[PDB]
Design an enzyme around this catalytic site. Structure first.
Site, mmCIF file in Angstrom:
data_model
loop_
_atom_site.group_PDB
_atom_site.id
_atom_site.type_symbol
_atom_site.label_atom_id
_atom_site.label_comp_id
_atom_site.label_asym_id
_atom_site.label_seq_id
_atom_site.Cartn_x
_atom_site.Cartn_y
_atom_site.Cartn_z
ATOM 1 N N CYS A 106 0.818 -1.206 0.000
ATOM 2 C CA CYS A 106 0.000 0.000 0.000
ATOM 3 C C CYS A 106 0.854 1.259 0.000
ATOM 4 C CB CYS A 106 -0.938 0.034 1.225
ATOM 5 S SG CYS A 106 -2.011 1.504 1.226
ATOM 6 N N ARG A 109 -0.001 4.615 2.780
ATOM 7 C CA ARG A 109 0.078 4.427 4.239
ATOM 8 C C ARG A 109 0.408 5.666 5.071
ATOM 9 N NH1 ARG A 109 3.914 -0.426 4.822
ATOM 10 N NH2 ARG A 109 4.354 -0.115 2.561
ATOM 11 N N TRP A 278 -9.198 6.070 -0.988
ATOM 12 C CA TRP A 278 -9.534 6.733 -2.239
ATOM 13 C C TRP A 278 -8.496 6.312 -3.275
ATOM 14 C CZ3 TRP A 278 -8.405 9.793 2.215
ATOM 15 C CH2 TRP A 278 -7.095 10.302 2.279
ATOM 16 N N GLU A 283 -4.684 3.545 -10.975
ATOM 17 C CA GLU A 283 -5.468 2.332 -10.737
ATOM 18 C C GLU A 283 -6.588 2.191 -11.791
ATOM 19 O OE1 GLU A 283 -6.130 1.194 -6.384
ATOM 20 O OE2 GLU A 283 -5.844 3.359 -6.118
HETATM 21 C C1 HEM Z 1 -6.332 6.627 1.716
HETATM 22 C C2 HEM Z 1 -5.999 6.371 0.454
HETATM 23 C C3 HEM Z 1 -5.303 5.078 -0.032
HETATM 24 C C4 HEM Z 1 -4.500 5.049 -1.104
HETATM 25 C C5 HEM Z 1 -4.139 6.244 -2.019
HETATM 26 C C6 HEM Z 1 -4.046 3.688 -1.276
HETATM 27 C C7 HEM Z 1 -3.213 3.226 -2.262
HETATM 28 C C8 HEM Z 1 -3.084 1.905 -2.611
HETATM 29 C C9 HEM Z 1 -2.736 1.380 -3.922
HETATM 30 C C10 HEM Z 1 -2.465 2.253 -5.175
HETATM 31 C C11 HEM Z 1 -2.714 0.047 -3.832
HETATM 32 C C12 HEM Z 1 -2.427 -0.966 -4.959
HETATM 33 C C13 HEM Z 1 -3.819 -1.437 -5.397
HETATM 34 C C14 HEM Z 1 -3.764 -2.283 -6.641
HETATM 35 O O1 HEM Z 1 -2.807 -2.139 -7.462
HETATM 36 O O2 HEM Z 1 -4.691 -3.120 -6.810
HETATM 37 C C15 HEM Z 1 -3.031 -0.313 -2.464
HETATM 38 C C16 HEM Z 1 -3.098 -1.579 -1.956
HETATM 39 C C17 HEM Z 1 -3.447 -1.937 -0.674
HETATM 40 N N1 HEM Z 1 -3.893 -1.114 0.340
HETATM 41 FE FE1 HEM Z 1 -3.982 1.002 0.146
HETATM 42 N N2 HEM Z 1 -4.573 2.913 -0.252
HETATM 43 C C18 HEM Z 1 -5.362 3.729 0.534
HETATM 44 C C19 HEM Z 1 -6.083 3.286 1.631
HETATM 45 C C20 HEM Z 1 -5.974 2.050 2.258
HETATM 46 C C21 HEM Z 1 -6.657 1.661 3.482
HETATM 47 C C22 HEM Z 1 -7.678 2.562 4.246
HETATM 48 C C23 HEM Z 1 -6.261 0.406 3.782
HETATM 49 C C24 HEM Z 1 -6.714 -0.477 4.973
HETATM 50 C C25 HEM Z 1 -7.369 0.037 6.039
HETATM 51 C C26 HEM Z 1 -5.315 -0.039 2.762
HETATM 52 C C27 HEM Z 1 -4.663 -1.264 2.689
HETATM 53 C C28 HEM Z 1 -4.169 -1.827 1.508
HETATM 54 C C29 HEM Z 1 -3.853 -3.218 1.271
HETATM 55 C C30 HEM Z 1 -3.954 -4.430 2.220
HETATM 56 C C31 HEM Z 1 -3.369 -3.268 -0.171
HETATM 57 C C32 HEM Z 1 -2.947 -4.514 -0.959
HETATM 58 C C33 HEM Z 1 -4.289 -4.989 -1.552
HETATM 59 C C34 HEM Z 1 -4.035 -6.179 -2.435
HETATM 60 O O3 HEM Z 1 -3.063 -6.939 -2.142
HETATM 61 O O4 HEM Z 1 -4.787 -6.332 -3.431
HETATM 62 N N3 HEM Z 1 -5.175 0.986 1.859
HETATM 63 N N4 HEM Z 1 -3.250 0.844 -1.754
HETATM 64 C C1 LIG Z 2 -9.733 -0.344 -0.985
HETATM 65 C C2 LIG Z 2 -8.752 0.087 0.078
HETATM 66 C C3 LIG Z 2 -7.389 -0.515 -0.219
HETATM 67 S S1 LIG Z 2 -6.432 0.643 -1.132
HETATM 68 C C4 LIG Z 2 -7.490 1.721 -2.045
HETATM 69 C C5 LIG Z 2 -7.246 1.918 -3.349
HETATM 70 N N1 LIG Z 2 -6.912 3.086 -3.689
HETATM 71 N N2 LIG Z 2 -7.349 0.914 -4.238
HETATM 72 C C6 LIG Z 2 -7.679 -0.292 -3.953
HETATM 73 C C7 LIG Z 2 -7.816 -1.368 -5.017
HETATM 74 C C8 LIG Z 2 -8.687 -0.831 -6.154
HETATM 75 C C9 LIG Z 2 -8.320 -1.380 -7.548
HETATM 76 N N3 LIG Z 2 -6.900 -1.253 -7.807
HETATM 77 C C10 LIG Z 2 -9.102 -0.653 -8.632
HETATM 78 O O1 LIG Z 2 -8.489 0.040 -9.463
HETATM 79 O O2 LIG Z 2 -10.342 -0.743 -8.684
#
Ligand code: HEM
Ligand SMILES: CCCSCC(=N)NCCC[C@H](N)C(=O)O
Ligand code: HEM
Ligand SMILES: C[C@H](O)[C@H](O)[C@H]1CNc2nc(N)[nH]c(=O)c2N1
Ligand SMILES: C[C@H](O)[C@H](O)[C@H]1CNc2nc(N)[nH]c(=O)c2N1
Ligand SMILES: CCCSCC(=N)NCCC[C@H](N)C(=O)O
Ligand SMILES: [Zn+2]
Lengths: 407, 411
Positions: A106, A109, A278, A283
């Site tokens: 992520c 963070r 958000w 993405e």
């Molecule tokens: C606040 C704005 C946030 C941004 C900009 C952000 C950004 C991102 C991005 C760009 C990814 C890669 C997603 C992908 O390529 O499918 C990601 C993955 C992830 N995020 Fe964040 N995130 C946010 C909020 C959160 C929150 C609130 C949580 C948990 C409470 C979280 C936990 C995770 C986890 C566990 C992954 C890996 C998901 C996976 O393995 O498919 N994120 N995040």
């Molecule tokens: C949902 C909270 C975890 S991180 C939030 C986020 N920014 N993306 C999450 C994954 C969404 C996916 N890559 C999509 O493009 O629909």
């Protein structure tokens, strides 16, 4: 045993000690790196509980205190007697925030401590689950000014009474295999859509049909619910210069909300824990729109731009990619829906990483995921060495329920 | 054991057995992945096993495993080691070894070409002047008036570690960088340190933005000596853009021949510390990294200014827009001048085919995703979607410390 990471753009060197508190395993060995692979009892539970409570009491600066020893004692008795235990609200909130803090994939963070936790452990039915989810959706969406949130359903017990959200995200579009041979809508969701249809969903068979929720309570068979249309904020996609762009008929939803993961806190397992933040622009604009096995729009867009598509070396794909991503960011900003571009997001992550190194001794990070899927080396994370390791509390992958569930 | 990798765009699953032949270590453990870390004299005792495993591979490749000729070669090498503490490769073994080091190079996207490598055997070289001559010939052969040919020149192997041959340049051809008193840099910031060394050694710096550096060459553990590559051997390309006529007035050029000269080639336990090799460019190495890194020529701002992009906010993607145009210009310029170059789409697509072919015929293809995925437009290349296994096979190319850190100066 103490490890160094270097930024090759700035020459800044940071020392990682946090990896020594690492618990879970990576998939790598001394002989083989698996860095680019997507998916690589009472006796068991008390060490896990102790480990967690220790870090909790240390965080509130009460380590070794009577109140620390008392809770450890309390939890121990409860496990011995009931084979499981229940987290205090404080511990649950701390656990959820830290699972996010520990999410090596992520980039967002820096936000980790600003997370609204919705305690749904009193939920008993799928209808209850649906109510909790609409409230999450509405709270997090906040008329476009998005707020991070997680909703936490009851923990696993004997594993035959699991709560699960069958959807991969709360909001996604349906995918349909056509008689033609093509795919209508989102090809990633073809199988889930079929499961919805088989369970009774009346599909509109359009390009952007918001999927129903398929909710499983207490290990029962999952049930269908439609999220109130007025709670699903969507953005029509236009370009600030190309007036034809709107004619492509593209839109996306504002709320990315991952719903298929497992939250592990103190050895306790929350199999239903949808969370949301958000979007980073790429993405949608790079992955969702341009992956060949997703909406795969590059060709159509390139054609509208009248690019020379005869040869790869005109970089027509690259040109159209940039424009699609400009249009995504532009459309979200114009409608006042929170979005972050990949420059701003990666810049914030570098600051977060340095904060985490000085205040915590490190920050686990998966470079393969953190580097954006366009313009890698013009973002500072490309030049940042990262160490990847698994800390707990954590978000884990789990098998899709239709492979596990017995009807 | 079998290890499987999946392509997430095609669902193609491949099975790796080759990793079982891996001996060297990765830097990773079950507790930590170091996959994004840039840099993570032998005994008779350790040498013969290395020689033996190498000759076993060599003899299997020629379908002569266990032959009398194979057994006699093992006996011959064993006796050479016991008697002299080292051994000499036959020319065939050297060619095979150098081709295999390339085949095994997990960070190289260009490996479809591995079997087409010109090997220059420079093991009779004794002096820096001799080295200079070998290197000129390599440059000229490889350049081939713009129709580039892969080549490697191999100088004598390490003996006691006190008589090493080294090329002090990181690449045969590179531009000087000069730190100014005001803290700005003229030319390439990557080569400031090496440039200072050259100047200290007596190079008369032109002090311009694109000054081809002199070769600094160490033979047989002696102090290194300076040589100017004849300018007529150094092929360069002025950079212009197919639609933007102002692009030429940025004053940009680049050299056609990428020739890495600071790596160590290991074959059968033997260490070739001077082994320059060259192929041809993938466009992004110039247009993304060399031009647009902040720590390099850093031209993004000036290009976007000239394009009149909205530069007030990052979210206009002005950097991304300028980046694409700069990269169009590099490919357009090389192509117009008939200098070999490959775009990142073509290169990665070829790599996927090579990789699948390698799985089928060799049981694997070690690959470093972090390096293989291009530094722009990552996910619109097929490699981004390809799972890869990174492990270390010999023969191999290794990093080695910069020689100015380790050299014992003679005077
Ligand atoms: C606040 C704005 C946030 C941004 C900009 C952000 C950004 C991102 C991005 C760009 C990814 C890669 C997603 C992908 O390529 O499918 C990601 C993955 C992830 N995020 Fe964040 N995130 C946010 C909020 C959160 C929150 C609130 C949580 C948990 C409470 C979280 C936990 C995770 C986890 C566990 C992954 C890996 C998901 C996976 O393995 O498919 N994120 N995040
Ligand atoms: C949902 C909270 C975890 S991180 C939030 C986020 N920014 N993306 C999450 C994954 C969404 C996916 N890559 C999509 O493009 O629909
Ligand atoms: C034939 C055309 C070739 C192409 C298009 C190509 C492509 C590339 C690229 C883009 C890189 C990454 C460079 C960087 O980011 O600095 C690379 C790395 C590498 N290549 Fe190739 N290559 C080619 C030929 C060769 C040859 C002939 C050899 C050796 C015989 C070789 C061995 C290597 C090695 C060892 C690396 C890693 C270098 C390092 O770690 O700095 N390549 N290649
Ligand atoms: C094979 C490879 O691991 C896979 O394509 C990864 C690469 N990096 C990624 N990075 C992010 N953020 N999201 C992804 O889905 C992927 N996919
Ligand atoms: C920290 C990180 O490993 C470093 O920036 C790497 C990433 N990938 C790369 N890939 C290539 N081809 N060349 C490089 O110099 C780098 N740099
Ligand atoms: C030299 C043979 C090994 S791989 C060939 C290659 N295509 N590039 C090499 C490295 C060049 C560097 N990236 C630069 O921009 O000068
Ligand atoms: Zn690893």
């Amino acid at each position: 045993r103490f490890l160094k990471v270097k930024n090759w753009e700035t020459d800044v060197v940071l020392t990682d000690t946090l990896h020594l508190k690492s618990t879970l395993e990576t998939g790598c060995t001394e002989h083989i790196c698996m860095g680019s692979i997507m998916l690589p009892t009472k006796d068991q539970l008390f060490p896990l509980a102790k480990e967690f409570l220790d870090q909790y009491y240390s965080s509130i600066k009460r380590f070794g205190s009577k109140a620390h020893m008392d809770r450890l004692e309390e939890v121990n008795k409860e496990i011995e007697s009931t084979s499981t235990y229940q987290l205090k609200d404080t511990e649950l909130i701390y656990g959820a925030k830290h699972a996010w803090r520990n999410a090596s994939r992520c980039v967002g963070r820096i936000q980790w401590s600003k997370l609204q936790v919705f305690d749904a452990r009193d939920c008993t039915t799928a209808h209850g689950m649906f109510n909790y989810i609409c409230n999450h959706v509405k709270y997090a969406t906040n008329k476009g000014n998005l707020r991070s949130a997680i909703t936490i359903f009851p923990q696993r017990t004997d594993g035959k009474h699991d709560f699960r959200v069958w959807n991969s995200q709360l909001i996604r579009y349906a995918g349909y295999k056509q008689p033609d041979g093509s795919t209508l809508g989102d090809p990633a969701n073809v199988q889930f859509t079929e499961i919805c249809i088989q369970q009774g969903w009346k599909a509109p068979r359009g390009r952007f049909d918001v999927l129903p929720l398929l909710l499983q309570a207490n290990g029962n068979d999952p049930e269908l619910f439609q999220i109130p249309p007025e709670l699903v904020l969507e953005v029509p996609i236009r370009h600030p210069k190309f007036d034809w762009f709107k004619d492509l008929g593209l839109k996306w939803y504002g709320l990315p909300a991952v719903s298929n993961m497992l939250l592990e806190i103190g050895g306790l397992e929350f199999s239903a824990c949808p969370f949301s933040g958000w979007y980073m622009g790429t993405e949608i604009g790079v992955r969702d729109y341009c992956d060949n096995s997703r909406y795969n729009i590059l060709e159509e867009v390139a054609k509208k731009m009248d690019l020379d598509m005869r040869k790869t070396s005109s970089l027509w794909k690259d040109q159209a990619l940039v424009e699609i991503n400009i249009a995504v960011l532009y459309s979200f900003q114009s409608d006042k829906v929170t979005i972050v571009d990949h420059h701003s997001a990666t810049e914030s992550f570098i600051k977060h990483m340095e904060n985490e190194y000085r205040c915590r001794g490190g920050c686990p990070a998966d470079w393969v995921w953190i580097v954006p899927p366009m313009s890698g080396s013009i973002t500072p994370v490309f030049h940042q060495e990262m160490l990847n390791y698994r800390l707990t509390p954590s978000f884990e992958y789990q098998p899709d329920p239709w492979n596990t569930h017995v009807w």
